[PDB]
Design a protein around this ligand. Structure first.
Ligand SMILES: [Mg+2]
Ligand SMILES: [Mg+2]
Ligand SMILES: [Mg+2]
Ligand SMILES: [Mg+2]
Ligand SMILES: [Mg+2]
Ligand SMILES: [Mg+2]
Ligand SMILES: [Mg+2]
Ligand SMILES: [Mg+2]
Ligand SMILES: [Mg+2]
Ligand SMILES: [Mg+2]
Ligand SMILES: [Mg+2]
Ligand SMILES: [Mg+2]
Ligand SMILES: [Mg+2]
Ligand SMILES: [Mg+2]
Ligand SMILES: [Mg+2]
Ligand SMILES: [Mg+2]
Ligand SMILES: [Mg+2]
Ligand SMILES: [Mg+2]
Ligand SMILES: [Mg+2]
Ligand SMILES: [Mg+2]
Ligand SMILES: [Mg+2]
Ligand SMILES: [Mg+2]
Ligand SMILES: [Mg+2]
Lengths: 126, 215, 144, 63, 120, 36, 192, 113
RNA sequence: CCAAAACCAGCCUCUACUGAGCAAGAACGAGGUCAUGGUUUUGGCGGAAAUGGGGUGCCCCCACCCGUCUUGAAACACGGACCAAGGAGUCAAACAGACGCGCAAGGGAGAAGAUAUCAGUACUUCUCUCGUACUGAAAGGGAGAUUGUGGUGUGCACACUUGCCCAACAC
RNA sequence: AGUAGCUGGUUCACAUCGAAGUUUCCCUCAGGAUAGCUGGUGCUUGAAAAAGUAUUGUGCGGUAAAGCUUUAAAUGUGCAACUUGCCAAAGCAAGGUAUUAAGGCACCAAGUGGGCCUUCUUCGGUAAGCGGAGCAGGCGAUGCGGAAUGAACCGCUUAGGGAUAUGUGGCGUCAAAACUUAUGGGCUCACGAACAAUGGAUGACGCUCAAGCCCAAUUAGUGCCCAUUAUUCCUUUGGUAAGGGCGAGAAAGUGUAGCCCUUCCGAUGUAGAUGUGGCGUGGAGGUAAGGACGAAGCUGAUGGCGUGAGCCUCAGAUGGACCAGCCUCUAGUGCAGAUCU
């Protein structure tokens, strides 16, 4: 009866307790070449360029970097199909992914039962 | 010319199947005598023996195909348990143990005995061949299916689907899932877990009995 | 052929493919294009987007005969030139001549790679046609 | 009435079609323009050297 | 060619006798009246038949040499594997049947002499 | 020219004796082992 | 008593017999059905299935587009290798836009009277699938081709026009009827 | 040995004299017969198809083949152990005299000689 | 034709470990069976016999009147006495997709005419029409590449041990 | 022949697949359009862009519980496996030399757009066989077996049949099975055996060292019965499934009385879609044939054939003169139901 752009975001865009405040320099010095995976975790302290809501926590590749924004391609399940969305986003709202950090570690490295001689052994009864 | 070369092959294959299953018989008799020494060693040593865990379960769909949920319904398809008393051998990876845990009310399973493996592969064994469900009848039939110098005998198959195999997937996948008859003498309750006095779920080594009445 | 209608297939199936529920009526919506701006709005807007409105200047009593300017491209002048006549047409030599009114064409658009010269004879020409036609060693000669 | 019943069933009939592969409709277009324009200058030069490369391969193949 | 002709007359012809859904050939020159390309000899460049001719077996033949001259396209010859020896002389594959018809033509001829005589 | 290119009983295998002896040639050498 | 979920959806719809009434297609299918089965060649399997297609799905090819695709193929051929036969399972149409063409050896179901004369004016043979089978029983250096069908005016109509990504052609006897102000229009481009 | 020897009769033909016994597929949600309740009449289906090499074979063991005149008999001359001529109902008793003393001479069978 | 028995095949049924027990493995032997396959044998029946069908009755068993709209019909919901004849997606036209046919950068005629012999068939001029060019409100303008696929990506077949890539998609 | 978004009817068979009662929009709410679901047609090629599932790795979350409006589950959820900008600059950037499983795409189109129940979660309501949602499953559209009975409970889902074995449910009679089994334990005297008024309901009887209840069992300290289910066999049909082959037959074949054989998998189904050398009717172009030795029509314990629509034959102690087959064309073409005429 009232679904505006930020319906039901009372908890979703809340800052964590004692973790309020605008994004730091580690945020600002992160850089996004295109085709990078990213996490569209929206940060409330930054309001310009905030991701809708569905896109909160979604992962996707950057398809686009403008000076303050990171274009991100994020799949959305619409119905019988995953439409492939293009949210525009201020870079604060994009946390770079480690979604492939294991797999990159792999091609980094690509580059039974027996006698138990145990002696302590309490009875298990009630 | 080829007519007789078909003989040189059919003779050479049982020479192989003889040689294979002579090894498998020894690899059973030896592996188990060795596994008796240790548990027997340990009893002398006042000491327990942690038997090696099962590396293969003979999962059996035990409820019918009606009223099943989309998650269970998918896991059963990926187990290839699409009918009632279908059976498959699935080795017990954590990822599988978490699939089996998702559909246990729909299945009975346990750790097949070598004998249970023989009876299914010899009696109920069917290869997929050109998508055809083909009753095993020749070792010729098996070597053609499995273009694999490892897998020639029907004894090759029983070792793979019992020892846990390096080709446990290569073998069990080329088998049509087993179509067992309902257990003779009946089940107990396809609704309760086995330890509840029912049927579904892991029943450890006891599956061999249950699965014996079926085969 | 009445034999082939599915009228004839569904003789016996009581509702002729119109459904037991939701019965086959008459005009469940209006006649023709009724509700193009209402209950069929999603339909015209999806498929016939420009359908409603007005777009340009009127031309009262249009006369299309004066407007008649059919076009043939350089790339298609082999359709008019005889294949036999067209056989040897060096740019520095004699050329087939191709009246285009005779052949029913008025302007001469200068599309593809003409390479065989011809003295095309036409009412109109493209900026690129007379240029191409010259560079091939041919020549448009204006007529009316 | 607004029940969403039978919808995920009706939706998974033809599956949830998975999203298009990244190598397909990879249009830029609305990409930050200044990068996009320099990309044209390179791609156009890739074309002149691609064609120039094939002209080489033929002349090389006349032997 | 015959491959084409047969594909023309195949769905209908004077000779096709599709009765009760059964399909036999009224063709004079077919040996077992089976509506088949092998047999449809009226159609074939070469053909052979082993019909009776008043007590005698008759073995009409059609080497292709006559071509399309119907008045003389067929050449009769009155006359048990010998008849098959004649029929294979024109159509080798027809011979195995041409023998077996040529027999059954004989048992018919023997059978009817028994029947025609018994009709007295 | 065209001919040149052309490409040129037991059910129960566990209990049936001959079937098993065929699938598992060693089985009789194994059954001999069973005596005793 | 079987899960069948998703089995029917995997059923494919294929032609297994020609709908063509034409006798010659049927003698031509009679050949390549045989030849496709009795040979190991993948060429006979393509000529045989294409031969079973709709005349819609057997699009005609320009002789212009054969001369292009052929020389582009043959230009690389090592000296003393004669060019591949240019088989098409469809009609071959003359192209006014290419007056002079190479001595092609095209092989197709049908030729325009224009294609056949230009094809022989270049000295190229205009052979049928009959002697294609008799010269290349296997697809030995045949160069199987297809005519275009994307530029077909039927497919210009695919989709909606009103839908933003689309450049479908609306159905209209009247070209000026659904004409529209630049303001009111669907967005032309749209990312998928 | 036939699957079903009974006709698949139309539902409730027995109550309504006008209804022919000939089969019509039942329709109507509530039809006991198409909802295939167990006590009801059966419907025809592919599963009642007769065995396919005994199909069309009359108890004589012959497949019937229609015959109209004496020339037809030779259509059965060479396959007289497979087909049995059944003379058409409307050939005259005149002509049937001729078909019959000739169907006798040829060893071809006739269903109604 | 009805039987019965046999034979073969098939098929089915009926040690080990452990501390007397099992989570345990076969063997021997025997039985069953043709609504299993192949091998006959032996008897019974033979104007009738025999198998099949049909008819009528019974027996045991199963079985809610159909059509209907409806979430739900056996419904205390509607329509329903019998039968016969009749009775309901048609025709035109304009589009579209698909499929068949013809020709194809063209296709087609229409009206009409001229002829020969029959409202048909045969024949044709001149045109017209859809198309090969699109775009813009409009005045208007109007598309090849660096003797030839504009490039690139993925791409049958074939070729040669990678090339060319047809179509096709995408860029 | 006004119009009717409404009511009623809408006539052969068989085979192949088979829904929806939801989205957006509509003076829309008994209707449309739209999308989804479905069919048909393909196209394209064959672990392509496979997945209602895990595992592993990496995000997301703030509900239950907790807590006194804050920490925080489980179930979930995402993801993964040389040329030309920037920099001070040539370096950076950009483009170039586990299990299982055929993937994707297009086109056309229907029905549908009253749903219902139940599971769990809830919201509203005093409560309801109540209104509203979330999830999934069902009925609708579906039997069959079982709960005595029941749309949706239980089991199982379905070609025509046989053997075998089961599932839920049973085993005193009804009623198949403990011919009232146990060489089992307790408990019980009066009732006892999943989801206020016509006399009367553990289903009925009846049962009481049960034929009740809890528990365990299976011949006993040395089981049995019943499914449209499973398995197996036969047959059919389908496969745009896999192969082989080319005394009478051996057809290069989608489809027929299927060219033949072999193997495999499938089979339900309302609305709906489609197929059908599918049925059948009046007429036409053909072909072939029949008829006063009896055409059509009609009658029929006339059988025969076909899954079937139906065809065929027989017999008329029917008729009295026309007419079936086959391919092609055509349509005023198939009737138990319209308070139909
Ligand atoms: Mg939050
Ligand atoms: Mg039970
Ligand atoms: Mg349950
Ligand atoms: Mg229907
Ligand atoms: Mg419809
Ligand atoms: Mg409607
Ligand atoms: Mg409605
Ligand atoms: Mg205007
Ligand atoms: Mg509604
Ligand atoms: Mg085009
Ligand atoms: Mg109601
Ligand atoms: Mg155009
Ligand atoms: Mg109605
Ligand atoms: Mg179905
Ligand atoms: Mg209503
Ligand atoms: Mg809280
Ligand atoms: Mg709380
Ligand atoms: Mg019941
Ligand atoms: Mg009893
Ligand atoms: Mg069906
Ligand atoms: Mg009429
Ligand atoms: Mg009667
Ligand atoms: Mg009518």
């Amino acid at each position: 009866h009232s679904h505006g752009y930020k319906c039901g975001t009372r908890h979703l865009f809340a800052k964590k307790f004692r973790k309020h405040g605008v994004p730091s320099v580690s945020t600002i010095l992160t850089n996004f070449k295109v085709g990078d995976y990213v996490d569209v975790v929206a940060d409330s302290a930054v309001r310009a360029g905030m991701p809708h809501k569905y896109y909160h926590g979604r992962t996707g590749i950057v398809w686009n970097v403008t000076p303050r924004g990171v274009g991100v391609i994020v799949n959305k399940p619409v119905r019988n199909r995953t439409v492939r969305k293009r949210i525009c986003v201020r870079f604060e709202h994009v946390r770079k992914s480690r979604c492939q950090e294991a797999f990159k570690q792999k091609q980094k490295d690509f580059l039974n039962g027996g006698i138990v001689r145990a002696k302590r052994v309490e009875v298990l009864a009630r | 010319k080829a007519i007789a070369a078909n003989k040189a092959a059919r003779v050479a294959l049982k020479k192989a199947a003889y040689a294979r299953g002579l090894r498998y018989s020894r690899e059973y008799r030896s592996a188990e005598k060795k596994l008796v020494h240790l548990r027997r060693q340990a009893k002398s040593c006042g000491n327990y023996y942690l038997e090696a865990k099962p590396k293969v379960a003979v999962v059996t769909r035990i409820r019918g195909i009606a009223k099943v949920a989309p998650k269970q319904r998918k896991i059963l398809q990926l187990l290839r348990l699409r009918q009632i008393f279908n059976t498959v051998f699935v080795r017990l990876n954590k990822p599988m143990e978490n699939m089996l845990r998702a559909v246990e009310p729909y299945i009975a399973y346990g750790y097949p005995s070598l004998r249970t493996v023989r009876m299914m592969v010899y009696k109920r064994g069917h290869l997929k061949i050109n998508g055809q469900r083909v009753k095993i009848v020749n070792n010729q039939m098996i070597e053609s299916k499995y273009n694999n110098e490892n897998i020639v005998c029907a004894e090759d198959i029983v070792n793979q689907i019992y020892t846990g195999g390096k080709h446990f997937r290569e073998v069990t996948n080329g088998l049509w899932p087993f179509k067992l008859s309902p257990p003779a003498g009946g089940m107990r309750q396809k609704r309760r877990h086995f330890v509840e006095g029912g049927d579904y779920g892991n029943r450890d080594a006891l599956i061999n009995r249950f699965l014996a009445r079926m085969i | 052929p009445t034999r082939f209608k599915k009228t004839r297939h569904q003789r016996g199936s009581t509702f002729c493919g119109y459904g037991r529920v939701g019965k086959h009526r008459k005009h469940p919506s209006g006649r023709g294009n009724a509700g193009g701006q209402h209950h069929h709005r999603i339909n015209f807007d999806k498929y016939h987007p420009g359908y409603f409105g007005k777009c340009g200047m009127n031309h009262y009593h249009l006369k299309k005969n004066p407007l008649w300017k059919p076009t043939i491209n350089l790339n298609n002048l082999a359709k008019l030139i005889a294949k036999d006549e067209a056989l040897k047409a060096k740019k520095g030599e004699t050329l087939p001549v191709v009246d285009l009114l005779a052949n029913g064409y008025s302007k001469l658009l200068g599309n593809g790679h003409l390479q065989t010269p011809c003295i095309v004879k036409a009412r109109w020409v493209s900026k690129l046609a007379d240029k191409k036609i010259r560079k091939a060693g041919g020549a448009v000669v204006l007529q009316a | 009435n607004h029940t969403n019943h039978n919808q995920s069933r009706k939706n998974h009939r033809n599956g949830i079609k998975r999203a298009l592969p990244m190598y397909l409709h990879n249009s830029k277009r609305g990409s930050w323009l200044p990068a996009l324009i320099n990309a044209r200058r390179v791609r156009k030069n890739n074309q002149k050297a691609a064609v120039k490369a094939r002209r080489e391969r033929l002349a090389a193949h006349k032997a | 060619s015959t491959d084409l002709q047969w594909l023309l007359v195949r769905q209908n012809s004077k000779f096709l006798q599709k009765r009760n859904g059964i399909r036999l050939s009224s063709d004079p020159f077919n040996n077992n009246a089976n509506w088949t390309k092998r047999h449809a000899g009226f159609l074939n460049t070469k053909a052979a038949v082993v019909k009776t001719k008043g007590d005698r077996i008759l073995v009409t033949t059609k080497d292709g040499k006559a071509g399309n001259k119907p008045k003389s396209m067929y050449k009769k010859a009155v006359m048990a594997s010998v008849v098959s020896k004649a029929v294979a002389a024109v159509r080798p594959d027809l011979a195995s049947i041409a023998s077996r018809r040529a027999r059954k033509m004989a048992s018919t001829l023997e059978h009817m002499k028994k029947v025609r005589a018994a009709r007295k | 020219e065209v001919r040149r290119v052309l490409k040129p009983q037991p059910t129960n295998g566990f209990r049936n004796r001959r079937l098993r002896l065929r699938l598992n040639p060693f089985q009789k050498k194994e059954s001999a082992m069973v005596k005793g | 008593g079987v899960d069948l979920t998703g089995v029917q959806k995997k059923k494919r719809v294929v032609r297994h017999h020609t709908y063509s009434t034409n006798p010659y297609i049927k003698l031509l299918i009679k050949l390549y059905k045989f030849l496709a089965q009795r040979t190991n060649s993948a060429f006979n399997k393509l000529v045989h299935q294409r031969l079973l297609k709709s005349r819609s799905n057997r699009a005609p090819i320009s002789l212009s587009r054969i001369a292009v695709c052929m020389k582009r193929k043959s230009v690389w051929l090592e000296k003393g290798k004669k060019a591949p036969i240019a088989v098409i399972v469809g009609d071959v149409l003359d192209d006014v836009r290419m007056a002079r063409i190479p001595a092609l050896r095209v092989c197709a179901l049908r030729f325009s009277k224009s294609a056949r004369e230009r094809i022989t004016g270049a000295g190229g043979e205009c052979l049928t699938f009959d002697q294609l089978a008799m010269v290349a029983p296997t697809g030995k250096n045949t160069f199987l081709l297809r005519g275009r069908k994307s530029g077909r005016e039927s497919v210009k109509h695919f989709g909606a026009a009103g839908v933003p990504g689309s450049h479908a052609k609306p159905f209209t006897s009247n070209r000026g009827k659904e004409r529209q102000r630049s303001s009111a229009r669907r967005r032309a481009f749209r990312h998928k | 040995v036939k699957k079903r020897t009974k006709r698949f009769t139309r539902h409730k033909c027995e109550l309504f004299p006008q209804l022919s016994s000939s089969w019509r597929k039942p329709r109507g949600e509530d039809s006991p017969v198409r909802r295939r309740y167990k006590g009801q009449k059966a419907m025809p289906n592919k599963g009642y198809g007769s065995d396919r090499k005994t199909k069309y074979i009359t108890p004589s063991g012959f497949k019937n083949f229609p015959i109209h005149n004496v020339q037809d008999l030779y259509m059965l001359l060479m396959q007289n152990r497979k087909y049995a001529g059944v003379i058409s109902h409307t050939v005259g008793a005149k002509s049937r005299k001729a078909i019959v003393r000739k169907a006798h001479e040829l060893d071809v069978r006739l269903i109604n000689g």
